[PDB]
Amino acid sequence: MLTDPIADMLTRIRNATRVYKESTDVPASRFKEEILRILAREGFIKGYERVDVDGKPYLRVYLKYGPRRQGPDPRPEQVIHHIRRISKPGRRVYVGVKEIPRVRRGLGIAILSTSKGVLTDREARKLGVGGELICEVW
Amino acid sequence: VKELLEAGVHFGHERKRWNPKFARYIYAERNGIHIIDLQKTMEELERTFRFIEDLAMRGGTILFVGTKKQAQDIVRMEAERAGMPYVNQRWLGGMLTNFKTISQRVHRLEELEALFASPEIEERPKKEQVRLKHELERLQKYLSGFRLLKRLPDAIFVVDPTKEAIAVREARKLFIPVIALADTDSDPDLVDYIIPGNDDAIRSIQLILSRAVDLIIQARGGVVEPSPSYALVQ
RNA sequence: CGGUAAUACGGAGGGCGCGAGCGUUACCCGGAUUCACUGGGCGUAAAGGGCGUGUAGGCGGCCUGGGGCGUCCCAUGUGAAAGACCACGGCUCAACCGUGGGGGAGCGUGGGAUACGCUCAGGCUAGACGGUGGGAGAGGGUGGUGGAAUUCCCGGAGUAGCGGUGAA
RNA sequence: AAACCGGAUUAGAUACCCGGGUAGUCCACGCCCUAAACGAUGCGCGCUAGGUCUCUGGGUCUCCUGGGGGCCGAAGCUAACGCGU
Ligand SMILES: [Mg+2]
C-alpha cells in the first residue's frame, strides 16, 4: 500500500541524486509539501512544484549538486549528502525542546514537526517547542 | 566553414550499442539508427574550440590519439601538420602515467638515430645489424609521434574514447583535460570537452580533426591549404 | 616456553614498576557494537519457518472538519537528610568535617498548542476488490482409452548353446 | 530391488562386478510429517541505467506496451565469491 509516505519521499530523493537526476516526482501530500518547503529554503533542493501525471497530483522536486569535479570520477559532490528517517510507523520518535538534536554541529538540519507547524531545529528551538523528529539531513 | 558542412556526411552513427549517458546528445532512432542532434554538436564545438584556442595560443601541447583502424593516418597528418605529438599504432600501458620510464624508450630510440649516421656507419658484429636495427624497427613504429612530447601534454585529443579508454583513464588520473570526438558508443561524463560526433566515418574524423588543427596553427598565425589529407579517402 | 648454547625453567649480576606495602585468588562493571534502544545480524561464516491459509496482534493512501488520548509548551506542587557536583570555610595539609549554591528525570494540579500519531464525522479514487471481453499452461480430482517394451503362457518353425565379464 | 541366497574379486571383501530374490516399488483407504523440503535467499509495497535471448497477452505490429523465464552486467552493495528492475 506504501506504508510510510514520508520515508518514501526521502528515499525517492536519496535515490534520484545518486544517479544525478535533474528532478523526481513524488506523489503529493500537504505534509510532503511542508517538508519540501524546508528543503528548498535551507538550500538543499533548487525547488519544487505541483504537477500532474496520469492526472494525479505529484510534486516535481528539482535537485541541486556541486560543480563537475577534479580527476578520475568527475561526479559532482552532492548537496544532499545524507537524508534519513528518524521517526517511523514502527517506532514514533518525539523530543522535548531541551532535547532536540544538533545535526553535524549545525552544518546540517533536522526537520521536525510541531503543533506550531513543521520546522528546522533552530526554528523550533527559537519558538521553544518540540515534537515528532521527522528526519535528519546533511 | 561549418554548419551544414557537418550534415555533409558526418552526423549520427552507431545503433543499440549505446551508452544511455549519451542520451542528452541524441536526436532520434530514425530508421533503426541513433542520429545525433547537431545543433548541440555545434554547441559543444564552440566551447571546445574555445578551449583549444586559448590552450594553443597560450602555447600549449595537445596530444592526439587515434589508434583506430580508419583514423590511423588522418591523425599523423593533422598532428604533424601542427607539430603536435600523436599516438598512432597502439596506446601503451602508461605513456602518461608511467611517463618517465616509457620515455627512456625515446631517450634510447634516438641513440639509434645516432648509430645510423655513425662511426659504426657499416660496423658491429654483423648479426647485430638485425638485433639492433630491428630494435630501432619497433621503436620507430610506435614512438614516432610520441617522441616530440618531453613533458605531459596540457591536453589530449581522442577520436574514440570507448576505443581509447586506457588513455583517457590516464589523462583523468593525471588531471590532464580530455578533448575528444565521441559518439553513442561513449560515456560523456569523463570527456571534459566533448565533440559529440561520429567516431567512425573517415570524412567525419577529417572535417573535424583538421579544423581543430586550423585553429591551432591559426592561433599562432599562418593558415594553410585544404590540408595534406584526403588519404585514399574512399 | 623446556629434546645440550633457553633474554620464557632455577640461580646470579644487572634492569623495569610500585612502595609500608607489593602480589595472588574470588567476585562486579569495562573493553564486549559479543543480546546491538543508543548500537548487530541470517546466499556460501551461526541464523528464513518445508509451503500455505489466515486468529489475536503490529502496521496503514489522499482531502476536510470536530475532539485533544498520545505528543509539545507555560505555571505550579512534589522530588527529606546524607551522598554527588561548585564555591568558601575548620582540623598545620589531606583524608574527614562545616556552611552556602546549583542541578534533577518521574509523578500531581492549573492553563495553553494541534503539525504528526490516535479517535469521531464527512469526502476522493492513485492501494485492494469486483464487471465485461479475450488468453497461455505437465495446476488438481474422476472415469475412460492408445501404442512401444519387458515377463510369462499357447502355436509355429528351428539346433546347441545362450547369458554374463576385466577375465570368469 | 534393501534384506537374503549364490558366483567372482580380494591379504580379507559382511562391497564395489555377476546370477537369483522377499519386503517395497503399484492401487484404495487410514497413519507418519521428515529432507541438500535449496535460489541453502520469508511476505508485501515504493524507488534506482541499459543490452541480449525467451514464453505468453495487447497496440497504430521497424517496433511499442503488460506479465513470466534467462544471461551480461549503470549506480550501489559484499569479507570476498558474487548480487545487480
Ligand atoms: Mg554479528
Ligand SMILES: [Mg+2]
Ligand atoms: Mg549456514
